[PDB]
């Protein structure tokens, strides 16, 4: 099999920067190599084919080069919507093989998360398990820590986190921290708070609510 190895595997660049992705084939594939862009969770899209040729409609800032064993994708003037994973795939010989991929993250200024906290719904309180969600919205960088508090008692091991993929417009991230408790354990306490510690926050932000108050 013809083996495709891409470098680097992941990188971070500012809007307007030049990024260069390298693709190497274990055998000579001539010029038949394709670059694919894939936004996270979405379908891949053909960018370059026969290594130098832009697909119709593709932004001109994507430029492929290289031949034989050595190939390069150059993104000139990086744009926010360029946040994605890129793959090279050889068409020269069967079986068709892709590269491992290159994850391109957009580097922007540090942005503080907007924190909202949602009590469990009345309907969920019927299920014997209560979930309270903390929303960290539109922040950079991706690193954050949610400190869950119940009656000021510290909580650990009861929470799970999801983080969205980078936004294609403002290049920010959003995070959700879900605190899972039993209904009886939820009704015994009063104050529920999530303390968010982030680089863009001088001191931690805390959003809180009282169990019965609202």
């Amino acid at each position: 099999d013809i083996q495709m190895t891409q470098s680097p595997s992941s990188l971070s660049a500012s809007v307007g920067d030049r990024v260069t992705i390298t693709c190497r084939s274990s055998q000579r594939i001539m010029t038949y190599l394709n670059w694919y862009q894939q936004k996270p969770g979405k379908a891949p899209k053909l960018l370059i084919f026969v290594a130098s040729h832009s697909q119709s409609g593709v932004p001109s800032r994507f430029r492929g080069s290289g031949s034989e064993t050595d190939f390069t994708l150059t993104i000139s003037g990086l744009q926010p919507e360029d946040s994605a994973t890129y793959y090279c795939q050889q068409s020269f010989w069967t079986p068709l093989t892709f590269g491992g991929g290159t994850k391109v993250e957009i580097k922007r200024t540090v942005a503080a998360p907007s924190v909202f906290i949602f009590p469990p719904s009345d309907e969920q309180l019927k299920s014997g398990t209560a979930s309270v969600v903390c929303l960290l919205n539109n922040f950079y960088p991706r690193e954050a820590k949610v400190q869950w508090k119940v009656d000021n008692a510290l909580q650990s091991g009861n929470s799970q986190e999801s983080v969205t993929e980078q936004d294609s417009k403002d290049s920010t991230y959003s995070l959700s921290s879900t605190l899972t408790l039993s209904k009886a354990d939820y009704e015994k306490h009063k104050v529920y708070a999530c303390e968010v510690t982030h680089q863009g926050l001088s001191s931690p932000v805390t959003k809180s609510f009282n169990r019965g108050e609202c």
Binding site: Q89, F98, V133, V163
Partner: protein, 225 residues
């Protein structure tokens, strides 16, 4: 438009079968060589099989060789993938991609997800995320939808049935210890319009028949209830 639409995926127990179907419209299907390319969760793109435009000339990755059988019906403009003797690693989202000769795959479908597990299907419970009485960041208030206790992936959340896509953040599914998944879908809207606008999350889980439209609304919060 140029459309490839995949169907026939879902939950299947290890060792069983399934038939993936891909229908083409808006381009000449007769002259296009069709491909299947899957993506395992967290993994990269993997080419599984492809078929020549004339049909009858097929190729397979050494992974699925002998198990998967690719076919096309040009009268129906449909590409088929028959997946037999499935394993756990075959779990992935499967794309069909059209390509012309060696020029690469220029036409892609939306993808269909194939889950291979011995666990039964389960439908989600959909709970509202009620916006707070203040929620003053400025005019922006946050509200959302909670989708919990379902299996397998994926689930489809829309807000007001595709009418409001702006500010919508639907988080990746978290696998719980119960073996099921959960995720939330949230949106930021003007706080002054909370009482004026009706906000509804439309959740759809294909492995079950579950389709739920949950109206999200604020409450009094003075007396709660």
């Amino acid at each position: 438009e140029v459309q490839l639409l995949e169907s026939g995926g879902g939950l299947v127990q290890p060792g069983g079968s399934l038939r993936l179907s891909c229908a083409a419209s808006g381009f000449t299907f007769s002259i296009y060589s069709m491909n299947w390319v899957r993506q395992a969760p967290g993994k990269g793109l993997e080419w599984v099989s492809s078929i020549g435009s004339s049909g009858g000339t097929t190729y397979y990755a050494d992974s699925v060789k002998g198990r998967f059988t690719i076919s096309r019906d040009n009268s129906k403009n449909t590409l088929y993938l028959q997946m037999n003797s499935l394993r756990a690693e075959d779990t992935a989202v499967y794309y069909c991609a059209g390509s012309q000769w060696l020029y690469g795959m220029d036409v892609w479908g939306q993808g269909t997800t194939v889950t291979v597990s011995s666990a039964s299907t389960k439908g989600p419970s959909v709970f509202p995320l009620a916006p707070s009485s203040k929620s003053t960041s400025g005019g922006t208030a946050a509200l959302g939808c909670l989708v919990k206790d379902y299996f397998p992936e994926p689930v489809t959340v829309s807000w007001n049935s595709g009418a409001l896509t702006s500010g919508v953040h639907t988080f990746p599914a978290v696998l719980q210890s119960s073996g099921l998944y959960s995720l939330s879908s949230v949106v930021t809207v003007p706080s002054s319009s909370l009482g004026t606008q009706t906000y509804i999350c439309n959740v759809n889980h294909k492995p079950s028949n579950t389709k739920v439209d949950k109206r999200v609304e604020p409450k009094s919060c003075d007396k709660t209830h």
